[PDB]
Write an enzyme that holds these catalytic residues in place. Structure first.
Site, PDB file in Angstrom:
ATOM      1  N   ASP A  74       0.853  -1.283   0.086  1.00 48.65           N
ATOM      2  CA  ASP A  74       0.008   0.167   0.104  1.00 48.65           C
ATOM      3  C   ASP A  74       1.025   1.249   0.071  1.00 48.65           C
ATOM      4  O   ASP A  74       0.866   1.987   1.243  1.00 48.65           O
ATOM      5  CB  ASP A  74      -0.874   0.056   1.140  1.00 48.65           C
TER       6      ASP A  74
ATOM      7  N   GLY B 214      -9.282   9.588   6.560  1.00 51.90           N
ATOM      8  CA  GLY B 214      -8.761  10.769   6.104  1.00 51.90           C
ATOM      9  C   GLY B 214      -7.317  11.121   6.452  1.00 51.90           C
ATOM     10  O   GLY B 214      -6.574  11.920   5.814  1.00 51.90           O
TER      11      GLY B 214
ATOM     12  N   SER C 262      -5.142   8.644   6.080  1.00 49.03           N
ATOM     13  CA  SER C 262      -4.864   7.809   4.781  1.00 49.03           C
ATOM     14  C   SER C 262      -3.505   8.314   4.257  1.00 49.03           C
ATOM     15  O   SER C 262      -3.972   9.387   3.516  1.00 49.03           O
ATOM     16  CB  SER C 262      -5.549   7.181   4.056  1.00 49.03           C
ATOM     17  N   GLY C 263      -2.704   7.425   3.843  1.00 51.62           N
ATOM     18  CA  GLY C 263      -1.529   7.953   2.994  1.00 51.62           C
ATOM     19  C   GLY C 263      -0.529   9.119   3.795  1.00 51.62           C
ATOM     20  O   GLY C 263       0.728   9.137   3.079  1.00 51.62           O
TER      21      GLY C 263
END
Ligand SMILES: N=C(N)c1ccc(O[C@H]2CO[C@H]3[C@@H]2OC[C@H]3Oc2ccc(C(=N)N)cc2)cc1
Ligand SMILES: [Ca+2]
Length: 223
Positions: free
Chosen positions: A84, A175, A177-178
């Site tokens: 991911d 939110g 995320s990443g």
């Protein structure tokens, strides 16, 4: 971020906001031309917003730069969230300064118990929804691989790690995320997945960046 605190404007200068008419994900500046985020944040038409604190107010230190290219990891698996990670190239190089700065990639994997800083504009509630306008921060330790895999049997790969608190109350969330998990000055993790947020015995799961550093470096050098 659930159970965290207001970071303070521009105190996490490598944190970026991915925007497609709205914030939808975080990311980390790893050099003036490139951002690392989660593959599950992929979308077309990304604008990278640097120097942000309040994402709904122009405060004067922002840089808005469109992505010129996205590269999802060649082996990303959206069913299991394995690998991911995604690279985003900036159309123009960011102008680096005290409020816009890159974060170092690691050269070794981090040990259980190492403290990290996780940040983002994600949900701040463990039950229900609330999205903050300024950047939130959380200190969380890396958890043993055995406690991680026991929390999520069958679903943790060696490209993932857990950080946080088994007792619950403190976690990253939707939110976020990443966004970054930074430990001892290096980008060791990327906000990836979890069961709900800040739930008991369900800590955050993060992409294990140390397993990707050669891919990152080779890919950016060739693009
Ligand atoms: N864009 C979609 N339709 C999409 C993409 C990804 C989705 O789910 C994955 C799986 O779980 C992650 C990721 O994005 C949503 C959720 O975000 C978080 C972030 C942190 C934590 C945690 N630390 N507790 C839990 C979940 C779903 C839909
Ligand atoms: Ca702003």
């Amino acid at each position: 971020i659930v159970g965290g605190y207001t970071c303070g404007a521009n105190t996490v200068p490598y944190q970026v906001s991915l925007n497609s008419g709205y914030h939808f994900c975080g990311g980390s500046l790893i050099n003036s031309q490139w951002v690392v985020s989660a593959a599950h944040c992929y979308k077309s038409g990304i604008q990278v917003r640097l120097g942000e604190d309040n994402i709904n107010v122009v405060e004067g230190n922002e840089q808005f730069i469109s992505a010129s290219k996205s590269i999802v990891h060649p082996s990303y698996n959206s069913e299991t969230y394995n690998n991911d990670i995604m690279l985003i190239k900036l159309k123009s190089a960011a102008s680096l300064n005290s409020r816009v700065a890159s974060i170092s990639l690691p050269t070794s994997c981090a040990s259980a118990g190492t403290q990290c800083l996780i940040s983002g504009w994600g949900n701040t509630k463990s039950s229900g929804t609330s999205y903050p306008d300024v950047l939130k921060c959380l200190k969380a330790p890396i958890l043993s691989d055995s406690s991680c895999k026991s929390a999520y049997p069958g679903q943790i790969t060696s490209n993932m790690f857990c950080a946080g608190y088994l007792e619950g109350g403190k976690d990253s969330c939707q939110g976020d995320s990443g966004g970054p998990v930074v430990c001892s000055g290096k980008l060791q993790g990327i906000v990836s997945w979890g069961s709900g947020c800040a739930q008991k015995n369900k800590p955050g799961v993060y992409t294990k960046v140390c397993n990707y550093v050669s891919w990152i470096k080779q890919t950016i050098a060739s693009n």
